[PDB]
């Protein structure tokens, strides 16, 4: 699959959830912490069905996150990513705490200026320290710029193609889900699907 999108799950599988989730996003958190467990055991476990994740970045925080998950070897992204999106109370708080000098460097300056600022602030060097991920490593992953403007391309034909707006949002089997926004909204979908 293209950058910014990763399977979980049998590519064959006949019932195929994509999922447009943010790592600064409040409800994609909840919504992880909510439905990881359900959907690998229920689902994906089973090869009833796959799971398809796309990085829909909506700020430069975000993608500072999205640049290192994506960064690591496919085997990796799933482990990573949940981590981010289950730990984001433990790492989101610059967002809410920082002042406006700081909030100045995140959205002016050339992409690797801003990347550095944002992992900095945000504490990205020790977060990934803890998981293996040394400072050179994670150096090379911030400057990948080509990388970034991938990502901001993917994003950019779920906005075009699917009118994707709010997170989390999901389609099934190429419907995009109207009124689905959270895992109680979008579990009875699935088990219709599934119990057919
Ligand atoms: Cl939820
Ligand atoms: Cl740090
Ligand atoms: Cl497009």
Not at 5 to 27: D, I, M, Q
Not at 79 to 95: D, E, N, Y
Not at 152 to 166: F, L, P
Request: aromatic content about 10%.
């Amino acid at each position: 699959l293209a950058d910014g999108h990763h399977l979980l799950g049998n590519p064959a599988a006949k019932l195929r959830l994509v999922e447009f989730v943010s790592y600064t996003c409040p409800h994609c958190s909840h919504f992880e912490i909510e439905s990881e467990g359900q959907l690998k055991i229920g689902m994906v476990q089973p090869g009833k069905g796959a799971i398809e994740v796309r990085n829909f970045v909506r700020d430069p925080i975000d993608m500072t996150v999205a640049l290192i998950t994506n960064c690591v070897p496919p085997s990796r992204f799933f482990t990573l990513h949940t981590a981010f999106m289950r730990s984001q109370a433990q790492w989101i708080g610059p967002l809410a705490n920082s002042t406006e000098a700081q909030r100045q460097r995140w959205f002016n300056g050339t992409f690797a200026t801003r990347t550095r600022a944002i992992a900095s602030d945000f504490r990205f060097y020790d977060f990934m320290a803890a998981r293996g991920m040394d400072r050179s490593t994670l150096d090379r992953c911030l400057s990948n710029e080509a990388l970034a403007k991938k990502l901001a391309a993917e994003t950019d034909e779920a906005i075009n193609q699917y009118n994707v707006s709010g997170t989390p949002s999901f389609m099934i089997d190429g419907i995009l889900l109207a009124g689905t926004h959270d895992w109680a909204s979008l579990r009875p979908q699935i088990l219709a699907r599934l119990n057919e």
